[PDB]
Design a protein around this ligand. Structure first.
Ligand SMILES: c1cc2c(cc1CNC1CCCC1)OCO2
Length: 330
């Protein structure tokens, strides 16, 4: 089997991407944030504290003939930005782009933090990291991909995120029309539960390539590219007026600037992130200070190849017995 679904930026900055997901019988379609950096499929629901719901579409298990309470199961998760959610668990039928999993754990939110309440466009998250990170207790649950894998034509999914435009998540096949050149594959460590890999280096603009190992995670659920302070300083040093602002919370730059590209290595291959991709616009409405799309990972504990990086590539998440990651230009 295979599945194919369009993923759409939630706003003009590509702050995140939402993908329609069918849950239950008859189908209830919710727009979820596919997150390769976590392993819980959770949704706004009829159980979510009413004051914490603000425009989202909710899952109502009592209206689904295939929903079953997973008795005794609870979940609670915190993300890298300090956001959080928690609740109880149902199993139900979940379909993405024509690919159906029965008995998928659908984690129903009773509580969500303010940042989720404030994102009216995100009805929940669909985790695509390794199931070892799933937070359901006392019986850990499998991701949608993990449940689907054995039935897929090939045990893979691909992320093809657009810049200021829709893109595609495919399950079970590689669309050879969706990228240019060849796909370069690179080793993955699953020891921390992430799609963790080592980049072979970087370049800033037309500058020479610096060969250096950068260990990080491929995370579709993180907006920006978070890299070591040395690398990030080298990038922003090429932008007149750019500076790290503690009050704003990262590098900012004059909105009048033309940003250089940033290249990252994947083995001997190179993925080029155009300068425009690194512009996250005014820090506040009407400001001439703009927020940078490449930021230091120093306060995070891990480097993160988030959407800014991934949207410059066609990315293969290969879930074979020994997982790997593939990157192609497009
Ligand atoms: C918070 C934490 C997350 C997440 C999504 C959220 C929701 N607010 C984000 C801010 C920009 C838009 C989405 O996906 C993984 O970790």
């Amino acid at each position: 089997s295979t599945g194919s679904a369009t993923t759409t930026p939630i706003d003009s900055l590509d702050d995140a991407y939402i993908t329609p997901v069918q849950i239950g019988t008859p189908a209830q379609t919710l727009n979820l944030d596919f997150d390769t950096g976590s392993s819980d499929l959770w949704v706004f629901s009829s159980e979510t504290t009413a004051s914490e719901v603000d425009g989202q579409t909710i899952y109502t298990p009592s209206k689904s003939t295939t929903a079953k309470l997973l008795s005794g199961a609870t979940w609670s998760i915190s993300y890298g930005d300090g956001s959080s959610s928690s609740g109880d668990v149902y199993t139900d039928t979940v379909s993405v782009g024509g690919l159906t999993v029965t008995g998928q754990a659908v984690e129903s939110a009773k509580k969500v933090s303010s940042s989720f309440t404030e994102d009216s466009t995100i009805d929940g998250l669909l985790g695509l990291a390794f199931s070892t990170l799933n937070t359901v207790s006392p019986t850990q649950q499998k991701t949608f991909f993990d449940n689907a894998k054995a039935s897929l034509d090939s045990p893979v999914f691909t992320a093809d995120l657009g810049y200021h435009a829709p893109g595609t998540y495919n399950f079970g096949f590689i669309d050879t029309t969706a990228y240019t050149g060849s796909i370069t594959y690179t080793a993955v460590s699953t020891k921390q539960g992430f799609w963790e890999w080592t980049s072979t280096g970087y370049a800033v603009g037309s500058g020479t390539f610096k060969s250096t190992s950068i260990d990080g995670i491929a995370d579709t659920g993180t907006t920006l590219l978070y890299l070591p302070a040395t690398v990030v300083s080298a990038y922003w040093a090429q932008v007149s007026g750019a500076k790290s602002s503690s009050s704003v919370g990262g590098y900012v730059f004059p909105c009048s600037a033309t940003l250089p590209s940033f290249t990252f290595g994947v083995g001997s291959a190179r993925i080029v992130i155009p300068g425009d991709y690194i512009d996250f616009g005014p820090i506040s409405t009407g400001s001439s200070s703009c927020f940078g799309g490449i930021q230091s990972s120093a306060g995070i504990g891990i480097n993160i190849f988030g959407d800014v990086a991934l949207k410059a590539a066609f990315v293969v998440f290969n879930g074979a017995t020994t997982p790997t990651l593939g990157f192609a230009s497009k």
